[PDB]
């Protein structure tokens, strides 16, 4: 919240500010003092988000998602085939949401390293839901890989989260 003030309240302030200073200096010459010139989030509930993408292959993307999750105290997980989930205080999620959508470019091209050498690689992201949950059973943020679409559910299944995946 901010107050402004008018032209005449600038003068009066500027002059009464200046006056005190110069007269105080004046005495100093008379007196001879002066030669003469924490991860954030909310405990009661838990804000959450969920994201869904075609490819995660780029490592630079794989790495950021591990850092920021550990950087901001976001609980959650990530999965894929051969979705992303995040939970915390509402300030945390907003940062992370900004990252996933507006900062990071998932459509961008990268040259990956394989066991033999380096090769080129030439995907989109969109949010599904943000909301509120009785408790977040996620203990830590654990990126993983699943071969099928089923153990992928059983993975979330452990967390009673089967539903968060959308075909």
């Amino acid at each position: 919240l901010g107050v402004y003030l008018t032209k005449k309240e600038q003068k009066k302030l500027r002059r009464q500010t200046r006056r005190e200073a110069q007269k105080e200096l004046q005495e100093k010459v008379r007196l001879g003092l002066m030669p003469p010139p924490l991860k954030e989030d909310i405990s009661q509930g838990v804000h959450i988000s969920v994201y869904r993408v075609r490819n995660l292959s780029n490592p630079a993307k794989k790495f950021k998602i591990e850092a920021n999750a550990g950087q901001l105290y976001l609980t959650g997980v990530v999965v894929l085939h051969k979705v992303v989930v995040v939970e915390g205080g509402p300030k945390a999620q907003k940062k992370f949401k900004r990252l996933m959508l507006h900062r990071i470019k998932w459509d961008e091209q990268t040259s990956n390293t394989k066991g033999d050498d380096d090769e080129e690689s030439d995907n989109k992201c969109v949010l599904v839901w943000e909301g509120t949950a009785k408790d977040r059973s996620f203990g830590e943020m654990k990126f993983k890989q699943c071969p099928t679409e089923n153990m992928a559910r059983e993975h979330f299944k452990k967390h009673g989260a089967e539903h968060y995946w959308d075909l």
Binding site: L1, G2, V3, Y4, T6
Partner: protein, 125 residues
Amino acid sequence: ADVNPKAYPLADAHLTKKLLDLVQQSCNYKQLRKGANEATKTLNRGISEFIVMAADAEPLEIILHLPLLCEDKNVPYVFVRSKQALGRACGVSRPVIACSVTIKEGSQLKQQIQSIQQSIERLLV
């Protein structure tokens, strides 16, 4: 205290703070038109981000055309309680009963404007 029921866009004390801050910033960035008259123009011209009015207006009717123009043009409008308060946020020593945050090219204020817009759209039910 009670406000005229007709000051349908009404902001609580929190939204009121944000609004007046953003108005004050818009006054600085020069995306601010102050006065019912100039706010009307920005609506007819199609250059209004959102509209803010004082439920304090003695002639409540003297600004009631704004929500109508707004509804047509699909522009968010909100009320605050105090026209003296709005005045101050507009740089003016005098009370200001309406004002308009106008569109500006590559505004630094864009994100904040977008955010305020959403809040106001929420109050409209």
